Short mmCIF file of C-alpha atoms in Angstrom, two decimals:
data_model
loop_
_atom_site.label_atom_id
_atom_site.label_comp_id
_atom_site.label_asym_id
_atom_site.label_seq_id
_atom_site.Cartn_x
_atom_site.Cartn_y
_atom_site.Cartn_z
CA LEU A 297 0.11 0.10 0.03
CA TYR A 298 1.46 3.53 -1.27
CA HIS A 299 2.46 4.32 2.95
CA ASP A 300 4.02 7.32 3.43
CA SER A 301 3.54 9.10 -0.45
CA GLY A 302 2.49 12.60 -0.67
CA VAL A 303 2.55 12.33 -4.47
CA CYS A 304 0.33 9.33 -4.41
CA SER A 305 -1.60 8.74 -0.95
CA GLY A 306 -4.84 7.71 -0.21
CA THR A 307 -8.42 9.38 0.28
CA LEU A 308 -10.33 9.19 3.14
CA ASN A 309 -13.44 11.50 3.51
CA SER A 310 -16.81 11.79 4.01
CA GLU A 311 -19.50 12.43 1.80
CA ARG A 312 -21.26 15.95 3.30
CA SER A 313 -17.81 17.96 4.13
CA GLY A 314 -15.51 16.11 0.95
CA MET A 315 -12.47 17.57 2.89
CA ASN A 316 -9.66 14.88 2.96
CA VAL A 317 -8.98 13.22 6.25
CA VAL A 318 -6.43 11.52 5.80
CA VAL A 319 -2.36 12.97 5.31
CA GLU A 320 0.56 10.95 4.56
CA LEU A 321 3.64 12.81 5.27
CA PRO A 322 6.96 11.30 3.00
CA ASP A 323 9.16 12.16 6.33
CA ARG A 324 7.43 9.22 8.11
CA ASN A 325 7.43 5.37 8.48
CA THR A 326 3.90 3.99 8.53
CA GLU A 327 5.44 0.41 7.38
CA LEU A 328 8.25 0.45 10.50
CA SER A 329 5.75 1.89 13.10
CA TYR A 330 3.39 -1.12 12.49
CA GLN A 331 6.66 -3.13 12.60
CA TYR A 332 7.77 -2.17 16.14
CA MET A 333 4.09 -1.87 17.17
CA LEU A 334 3.31 -4.87 16.15
CA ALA A 335 6.67 -6.69 17.73
CA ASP A 336 5.87 -4.93 20.81
CA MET A 337 2.45 -5.68 21.30
CA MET A 338 3.82 -9.54 20.59
CA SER A 339 6.73 -11.83 20.31
CA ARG A 340 7.31 -12.18 16.32
CA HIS A 341 8.43 -15.38 16.17
CA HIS A 342 4.58 -15.97 15.97
CA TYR A 343 3.33 -16.73 12.34
CA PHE A 344 0.17 -15.35 11.21
CA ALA A 345 -0.95 -15.81 7.94
CA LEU A 346 -3.56 -13.60 7.86
CA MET B 159 -9.88 6.03 -51.39
CA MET B 160 -10.86 3.18 -53.72
CA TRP B 161 -7.26 0.40 -52.41
CA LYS B 162 -8.79 -1.93 -55.06
CA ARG B 163 -9.00 -1.75 -58.92
CA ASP B 164 -8.92 -4.16 -61.38
CA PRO B 165 -6.40 -3.76 -64.26
CA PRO B 166 -6.57 -1.75 -66.56
CA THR B 167 -8.52 -2.48 -70.14
CA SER B 168 -6.54 0.12 -72.16
CA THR B 169 -3.67 1.94 -71.30
CA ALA B 170 -3.55 4.62 -73.85
CA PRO B 171 -4.90 8.48 -73.07
CA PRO B 172 -8.68 8.41 -73.35
CA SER B 173 -10.52 9.56 -76.24
CA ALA B 174 -14.46 9.43 -75.41
CA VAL B 175 -15.95 12.62 -73.31
CA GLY B 176 -16.81 10.68 -70.73
CA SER B 177 -20.64 9.69 -70.41
CA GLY B 178 -20.55 7.65 -67.28
CA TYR B 179 -18.29 7.22 -64.55
CA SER B 180 -16.83 3.63 -63.82
CA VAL B 181 -14.33 2.34 -62.30
CA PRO B 182 -14.98 -1.30 -62.18
CA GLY B 183 -13.99 -4.00 -59.92
CA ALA B 184 -13.32 -0.16 -57.10
CA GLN B 185 -13.58 -1.77 -53.52
CA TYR B 186 -13.19 1.01 -51.14
CA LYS B 187 -11.58 1.31 -47.51
CA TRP B 188 -11.94 2.97 -44.86
CA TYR B 189 -7.73 4.81 -44.49
CA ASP B 190 -6.25 6.37 -41.23
CA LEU B 191 -3.82 8.66 -42.69
CA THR B 192 -1.58 10.29 -39.59
CA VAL B 193 0.59 14.16 -40.71
CA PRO B 194 4.26 13.78 -38.80
CA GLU B 195 3.14 15.67 -35.73
CA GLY B 196 4.48 19.17 -35.18
CA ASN B 197 3.76 23.27 -35.50
CA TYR B 198 3.38 24.15 -39.31
CA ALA B 199 1.60 26.65 -41.25
CA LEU B 200 -1.02 25.04 -42.87
CA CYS B 201 0.06 25.49 -46.87
CA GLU B 202 3.04 22.93 -45.49
CA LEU B 203 0.03 20.83 -43.25
CA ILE B 204 -1.86 20.83 -47.31
CA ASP B 205 1.03 19.80 -48.45
CA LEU B 206 1.82 16.60 -45.86
CA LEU B 207 -1.49 15.19 -46.17
CA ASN B 208 -1.05 14.87 -50.11
CA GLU B 209 2.48 13.09 -49.40
CA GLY B 210 0.72 11.44 -46.92
CA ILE B 211 -2.79 10.42 -49.76
CA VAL B 212 0.37 9.27 -51.46
CA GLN B 213 1.42 6.91 -49.43
CA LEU B 214 -0.86 5.29 -48.23
CA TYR B 215 -1.74 4.97 -52.18
CA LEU B 216 1.47 3.72 -52.73
CA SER B 217 1.42 1.37 -49.85
CA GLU B 218 -1.06 -1.14 -50.99
CA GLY B 219 -3.05 0.43 -53.85
CA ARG B 220 -0.62 1.51 -56.75
CA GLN B 221 0.53 -2.18 -56.35
CA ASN B 222 -3.25 -3.62 -56.94
CA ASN B 223 -3.60 -1.73 -60.23
CA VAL B 224 -4.76 1.80 -59.26
CA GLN B 225 -5.01 3.97 -62.79
CA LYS B 226 -3.08 6.56 -60.85
CA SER B 227 -6.21 8.64 -61.17
CA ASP B 228 -8.03 6.59 -58.72
CA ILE B 229 -6.63 9.39 -55.44
CA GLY B 230 -9.50 9.72 -54.52
CA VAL B 231 -9.01 12.12 -51.18
CA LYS B 232 -7.22 14.99 -52.06
CA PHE B 233 -6.34 18.64 -49.98
CA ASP B 234 -6.00 21.56 -52.02
CA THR B 235 -7.02 25.57 -51.90
CA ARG B 236 -7.61 25.86 -55.53
CA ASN B 237 -11.33 27.64 -56.91
CA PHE B 238 -11.78 25.02 -59.02
CA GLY B 239 -14.87 27.11 -60.55
CA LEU B 240 -13.29 30.31 -61.67
CA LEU B 241 -12.14 31.33 -64.96
CA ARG B 242 -15.28 29.69 -66.68
CA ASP B 243 -17.41 30.76 -69.24
CA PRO B 244 -21.40 29.97 -68.84
CA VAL B 245 -22.10 29.68 -72.30
CA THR B 246 -18.74 26.85 -73.22
CA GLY B 247 -19.26 25.35 -69.96
CA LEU B 248 -15.59 24.77 -69.71
CA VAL B 249 -12.62 27.31 -68.12
CA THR B 250 -11.40 29.26 -70.99
CA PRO B 251 -7.61 29.10 -69.63
CA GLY B 252 -7.17 25.44 -70.36
CA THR B 253 -6.02 25.56 -66.13
CA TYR B 254 -7.04 26.28 -63.24
CA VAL B 255 -6.70 29.25 -61.75
CA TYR B 256 -3.08 28.50 -58.89
CA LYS B 257 -4.22 30.68 -56.51
CA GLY B 258 -4.79 29.14 -52.78
CA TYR B 259 -8.01 30.79 -51.51
CA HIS B 260 -9.07 28.16 -49.02
CA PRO B 261 -8.56 24.49 -48.33
CA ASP B 262 -10.48 22.31 -49.75
CA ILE B 263 -11.60 18.28 -50.71
CA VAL B 264 -11.52 16.66 -53.60
CA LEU B 265 -13.36 13.01 -53.21
CA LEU B 266 -13.78 10.68 -56.12
CA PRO B 267 -17.09 8.73 -56.90
CA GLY B 268 -17.07 6.03 -53.91
CA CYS B 269 -14.69 8.53 -51.40
CA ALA B 270 -15.47 9.74 -48.16
CA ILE B 271 -12.94 12.02 -45.86
CA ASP B 272 -14.25 11.10 -42.03
CA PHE B 273 -13.00 14.28 -39.49
CA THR B 274 -15.49 12.92 -36.51
CA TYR B 275 -12.22 11.13 -34.62
CA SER B 276 -10.33 14.32 -35.17
CA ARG B 277 -10.17 18.02 -34.81
CA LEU B 278 -7.93 18.50 -37.96
CA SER B 279 -11.23 19.82 -39.37
CA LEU B 280 -11.04 23.24 -37.86
CA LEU B 281 -7.67 24.01 -38.60
CA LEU B 282 -9.07 23.16 -42.99
CA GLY B 283 -11.85 25.63 -42.08
CA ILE B 284 -14.34 23.11 -42.60
CA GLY B 285 -16.53 22.40 -39.57
CA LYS B 286 -19.75 21.34 -39.57
CA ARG B 287 -22.91 23.69 -39.27
CA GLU B 288 -24.22 21.63 -36.24
CA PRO B 289 -21.16 20.90 -34.42
CA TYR B 290 -22.87 18.08 -31.64
CA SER B 291 -24.35 16.39 -34.60
CA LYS B 292 -22.63 12.86 -34.16
CA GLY B 293 -20.20 12.07 -36.95
CA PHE B 294 -18.51 14.69 -39.25
CA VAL B 295 -17.85 12.82 -42.90
CA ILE B 296 -17.90 14.32 -46.30
CA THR B 297 -18.81 11.50 -48.08
CA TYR B 298 -18.69 12.12 -52.26
CA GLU B 299 -22.87 12.66 -52.11
CA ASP B 300 -22.60 15.45 -49.88
CA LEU B 301 -20.41 17.12 -52.60
CA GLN B 302 -23.30 17.00 -55.02
CA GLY B 303 -23.34 20.37 -57.53
CA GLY B 304 -20.14 21.21 -56.46
CA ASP B 305 -18.85 19.82 -59.98
CA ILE B 306 -15.34 20.46 -60.94
CA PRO B 307 -15.41 21.93 -64.91
CA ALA B 308 -13.60 20.02 -67.21
CA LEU B 309 -10.65 22.21 -68.93
CA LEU B 310 -11.35 23.34 -72.65
CA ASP B 311 -8.25 22.21 -74.65
CA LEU B 312 -6.51 24.43 -76.57
CA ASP B 313 -5.31 22.63 -79.23
CA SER B 314 -9.32 21.30 -79.77
CA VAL B 315 -10.14 25.68 -79.87
CA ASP B 316 -6.73 27.12 -81.28
CA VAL B 317 -8.58 29.95 -83.38
CA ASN B 318 -7.70 31.87 -79.18
CA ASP B 319 -4.39 31.92 -80.53
CA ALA B 320 -4.91 32.07 -83.93
CA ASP B 321 -5.53 34.00 -86.92
CA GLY B 322 -5.93 37.84 -84.89
CA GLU B 323 -9.32 35.93 -83.08
CA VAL B 324 -10.47 34.36 -79.73
CA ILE B 325 -14.00 33.91 -80.25
CA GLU B 326 -14.97 30.34 -80.95
CA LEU B 327 -17.34 27.93 -81.14
CA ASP B 328 -19.50 24.50 -80.92
CA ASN B 329 -15.16 22.98 -81.31
CA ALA B 330 -15.26 23.32 -77.63
CA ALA B 331 -13.67 20.42 -75.69
CA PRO B 332 -12.84 18.86 -72.68
CA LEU B 333 -8.94 17.26 -71.74
CA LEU B 334 -10.16 13.78 -70.74
CA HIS B 335 -6.34 13.62 -69.88
CA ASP B 336 -3.20 15.13 -69.45
CA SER B 337 0.08 16.53 -70.84
CA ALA B 338 1.60 12.93 -68.94
CA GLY B 339 -1.33 10.11 -69.89
CA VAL B 340 -2.89 9.68 -67.08
CA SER B 341 -7.10 11.17 -67.53
CA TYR B 342 -9.19 13.71 -65.64
CA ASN B 343 -12.44 11.34 -65.67
CA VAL B 344 -14.25 13.91 -67.23
CA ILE B 345 -17.64 12.59 -68.45
CA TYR B 346 -21.02 14.42 -68.43
CA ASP B 347 -23.49 14.56 -66.28
CA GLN B 348 -27.03 13.20 -65.28
CA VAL B 349 -28.18 16.92 -66.31
CA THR B 350 -25.96 16.36 -69.14
CA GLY B 351 -24.90 19.62 -70.03
CA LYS B 352 -21.47 20.61 -71.36
CA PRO B 353 -19.37 18.01 -69.54
CA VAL B 354 -17.59 18.82 -65.99
CA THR B 355 -15.51 15.86 -64.47
CA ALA B 356 -16.72 14.31 -61.93
CA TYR B 357 -14.34 15.67 -58.75
CA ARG B 358 -16.66 17.43 -56.57
CA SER B 359 -14.04 19.94 -54.92
CA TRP B 360 -16.01 21.16 -51.67
CA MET B 361 -15.45 24.23 -52.42
CA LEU B 362 -18.11 24.26 -55.18
CA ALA B 363 -20.30 22.20 -53.49
CA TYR B 364 -20.30 25.26 -50.73
CA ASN B 365 -20.03 28.18 -52.75
CA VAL B 366 -23.23 26.72 -54.38
CA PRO B 367 -25.70 28.23 -52.21
CA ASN B 368 -28.51 26.02 -52.68
CA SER B 369 -28.06 22.98 -50.05
CA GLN B 370 -26.49 20.46 -49.06
CA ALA B 371 -22.96 21.64 -48.74
CA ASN B 372 -24.66 25.41 -47.19
CA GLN B 373 -26.73 23.39 -44.88
CA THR B 374 -24.87 20.59 -43.09
CA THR B 375 -20.62 22.19 -43.51
CA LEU B 376 -19.57 25.76 -42.43
CA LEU B 377 -16.37 27.75 -44.77
CA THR B 378 -14.42 29.22 -42.04
CA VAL B 379 -10.58 30.48 -41.68
CA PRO B 380 -8.25 27.75 -41.48
CA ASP B 381 -7.63 28.74 -37.72
CA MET B 382 -3.76 27.24 -37.90
CA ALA B 383 -4.31 27.58 -33.88
CA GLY B 384 -4.60 24.05 -33.29
CA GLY B 385 -8.02 24.20 -32.59
CA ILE B 386 -7.88 24.19 -29.11
CA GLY B 387 -9.87 24.85 -26.02
CA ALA B 388 -10.17 25.81 -23.23
CA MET B 389 -7.75 24.78 -19.99
CA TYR B 390 -8.76 23.95 -16.37
CA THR B 391 -6.28 24.70 -14.15
CA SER B 392 -6.69 23.00 -10.96
CA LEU B 393 -5.40 23.98 -7.06
CA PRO B 394 -6.59 21.44 -4.92
CA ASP B 395 -5.10 21.79 -1.76
CA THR B 396 -5.91 25.22 -1.56
CA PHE B 397 -8.74 26.06 -3.10
CA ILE B 398 -12.70 24.85 -1.66
CA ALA B 399 -14.08 22.95 -4.19
CA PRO B 400 -16.51 24.92 -6.28
CA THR B 401 -20.50 24.49 -6.29
CA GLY B 402 -21.25 21.48 -7.94
CA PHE B 403 -17.41 19.90 -7.39
CA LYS B 404 -16.70 16.83 -4.85
CA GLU B 405 -13.29 16.56 -3.58
CA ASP B 406 -11.57 14.47 -5.58
CA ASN B 407 -8.13 15.89 -4.72
CA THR B 408 -5.74 12.07 -5.52
CA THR B 409 -6.92 12.05 -8.95
CA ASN B 410 -6.65 14.21 -12.20
CA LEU B 411 -10.09 15.22 -11.51
CA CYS B 412 -9.55 17.63 -9.57
CA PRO B 413 -12.33 20.74 -9.13
CA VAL B 414 -11.14 23.46 -11.42
CA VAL B 415 -10.39 26.65 -9.69
CA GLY B 416 -9.80 28.44 -12.71
CA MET B 417 -11.20 28.73 -16.19
CA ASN B 418 -8.98 30.00 -18.75
CA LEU B 419 -9.17 30.06 -22.81
CA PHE B 420 -5.33 28.05 -24.84
#
């Protein structure tokens, strides 16, 4: 998924307030953030196929 | 422009004055004429279009026994129906007025040109009277009444440069061919008055004020600005979408912020 890319980012927004409410900055690391979070919540040797 | 034709029955230049246009075994197919991309003036654009038609001929029609007088489509600028005589019915000089006036389409019977998927029509100064009507095709029948007048041969009526005279009658004949053999397809029309070649210039079709080329097409200036429409500048990241626009930022259909011509 195109994470942390401001040129090809996603768009989650409502309809009445059509303003895009997701902003992705090129200077953040979403995938490494998920890596560290997931490693903190539980050990990494578990193989979760989903 | 009639890719396929049977071999000719006679190689000699024609001697009979028409009396019915007929090309035996004529098969017609649609082409895709394309000029190289680049900034051109209109004279050289028409020259490239004619060269492209010649190339489309050389690709398959030349090897397929086409008489080389059957180049169906041509882009020209001459006013063919000029300097003719109302009584003689042919152009007095024996040649055509080699002066450019406006881009013109010359079509053999069974031939057509299709502008429905191209705005090059705006470059030629040919526009439909109903620009929103689906399909803009100039067929041969759409040019009815725009028959190109045939050329009064000097050899037949040679009193013009003889015996101190310029006036003569009933020896008037049209050029049935040219200097280099190839024919003009000069025939007698359905209202078999003076013979005229079957070429149906779009200029002449428009100039006759009755119908068809006036009530369907339009003669305007060639407008070599490219015929480009409007340009939509958009700033999705600093402007609330105008009324009627949805917020589509991460795509090319962003709300239009600034309207401007090209």
